[PDB]
Symmetry: D4
Subunit: 104 residues, 8 copies
Amino acid sequence: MFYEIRTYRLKNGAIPAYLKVVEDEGIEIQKSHLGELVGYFFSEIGPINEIVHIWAFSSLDDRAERRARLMADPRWLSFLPKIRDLIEVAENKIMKPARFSPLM
Amino acid sequence: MFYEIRTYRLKNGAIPAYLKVVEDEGIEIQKSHLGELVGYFFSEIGPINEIVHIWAFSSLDDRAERRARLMADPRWLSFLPKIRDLIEVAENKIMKPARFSPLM
Amino acid sequence: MFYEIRTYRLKNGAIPAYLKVVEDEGIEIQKSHLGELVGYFFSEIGPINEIVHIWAFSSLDDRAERRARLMADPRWLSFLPKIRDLIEVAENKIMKPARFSPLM
Amino acid sequence: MFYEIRTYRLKNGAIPAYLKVVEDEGIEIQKSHLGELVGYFFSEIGPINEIVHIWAFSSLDDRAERRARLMADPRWLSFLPKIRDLIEVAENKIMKPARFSPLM
Amino acid sequence: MFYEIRTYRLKNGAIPAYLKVVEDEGIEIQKSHLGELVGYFFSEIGPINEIVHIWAFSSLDDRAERRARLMADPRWLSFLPKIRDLIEVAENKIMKPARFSPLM
Amino acid sequence: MFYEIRTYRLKNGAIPAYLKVVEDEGIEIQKSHLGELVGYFFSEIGPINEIVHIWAFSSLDDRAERRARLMADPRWLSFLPKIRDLIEVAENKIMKPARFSPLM
Amino acid sequence: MFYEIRTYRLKNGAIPAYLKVVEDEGIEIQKSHLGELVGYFFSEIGPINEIVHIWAFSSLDDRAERRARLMADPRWLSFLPKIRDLIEVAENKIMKPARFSPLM
Amino acid sequence: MFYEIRTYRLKNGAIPAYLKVVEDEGIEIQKSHLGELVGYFFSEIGPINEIVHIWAFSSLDDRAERRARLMADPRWLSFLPKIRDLIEVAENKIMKPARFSPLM
């Protein structure tokens, strides 16, 4: 399985607002397209104003396929503007599970 | 629940060796002390020679308690030298799960 | 004892304004909740527009408890918006005192 | 008062060794020259293998004066080699105390 | 041959807008002055909101010459304001092709 | 098309040695597996001791497939040790070509 | 002699405006207070939108003295707002000349 | 005029050794090839174990020409190994002087 880890640094103080709108209007739409959400966290100790969420994909072409459909969803497009200015810097990475990882 | 995310950058080319000794001699000892391993990953696309593992703790004082016992385990101390020089740079952070996170 | 070190990078030229409102409306409220302020500094030589303050906690669960109360304080919530846009980037870390540290 | 903050990133796993030799052979020599040690900490949560110590100076020329005598102390010179290879990366910065800082 | 690699970090969510106006109003003007465009990419996995484009120059004085003319082009100056606020951080570097590089 | 950009920071002064052994023993083996090499560069102005090479893949699952075969090649495994210690830090990213990119 | 190196990252595209107002209204005021300007540069190849200027001081307490007077100059205070929002991130450092440095 | 700024981070504690061998065996050879040394500094406050030297070039092709000759000098090649392992990380950048820069 492939694990995508996305890390965002939000505008200082935007985490509460971000998590509210995501919970209320984005996460369900996103999960119906992307598949398996592994974890969704916000900072406590370390980088402040940070969001980290992990998604698992069977293959990377499947990921491309799923993300393409998510991006086409007009409901997703209507949602994006609600967090588009809350996120200042972002990046994502693909990782693989160790043989001894619960996540496989 | 508290989530600790540890990220290491290993010596270039050390991931295979690192994952083998961890699987063979460290992970079980570590899991018997720390409790719940959420995920253990190695790089594929993004930062190279990277290890990322996540652990969940009921409270931070419980984390402190568990890590103190792990550090006292002479089996742990016998193991550490096997990855101590494979890891070049490291850092860890504590995060909290979003209400809509599978991980809670 | 636990030492929390928070480092912020403010909007260029915001330190004077920041330090004035903190002194006038935030530090006392914060101290009555958080406990022991170890030091509060602003840059001179090195990173510019930087704020660094250190707080000591008996335990991390006590820290969590104290910060929860501070976050619940409506006076704190009325103050936050006064520095919320003055801070651009932030992060915090927990450290422990060396046996030979005055700070223990 | 001026506050100098020195931050070092040590070789992975070198904190115990570092703190022991500093306590046993360096800190007293250093304190007799530099004056006031404000705090000496090692990482717990955040950057790993990190040392952070803070020194207060009445003036920066006094700091220069004090550090020149410390560097001239042959006992200091005999000590340095004991942590010179334990430290990988380092940096220091000068800051000033806020009017509401305990540290002034 | 010299290869210049320019990397920009755009405002979160600005890639589509940026790529549209560049395609519609800037790339042709830029190519007629700079010479050979080697590649123009936007992020997918790794740093998000990133643009990376590569240009080849026979010599660095030739590069200077070409960029001077591009900067003098009033059509270029009329275009710049259209992406000037879409780019947050940028940097460029000059590199040389390996003997076994297709790009020479 | 997908473009993978790999950037390495080598041991200070290792570029000549690195480029020689790659040219002599690694690049051909690598190209026979990976497919299309877009460019292979070493620093001149900017980050020093840096290597940047770009590879194009039709799909990411094809990339996975090709890299799996490359990693299985015992000739590749015999070569790796020759640059494994010349590379200090590394990272890779996947990007897409702009519609106006020669590289598509 | 002491050399202070200040490095700023300006808003994308602000260098021309910055350099004009500094030349027209700030540099002379600043030089009459600070003493010896060693060099004032703006980026070309490397970090973009960057300003780097170097000032030489006989002693650090002299630097403190001179900068205090510059900060007190009402003409300086009237000027500051003109570049205060053009500069996004900044930092400064003190260095010493090598015995073989023209700058001593 | 073009200004090249080279910044190196040396092995912890290597500055004295580095500066000695450069003064004794490298700087003169280097100056006879490169032309005008603007300044050569080592850290005091800020990044520790850092070297920063600045060279001025009439044109970038002239710089290429001069550095090619320096690299061909067998005396330079005999010297390089003496600082090659003292330098851990490096980078250089080209900048231009402001109209009001003493350095033009």
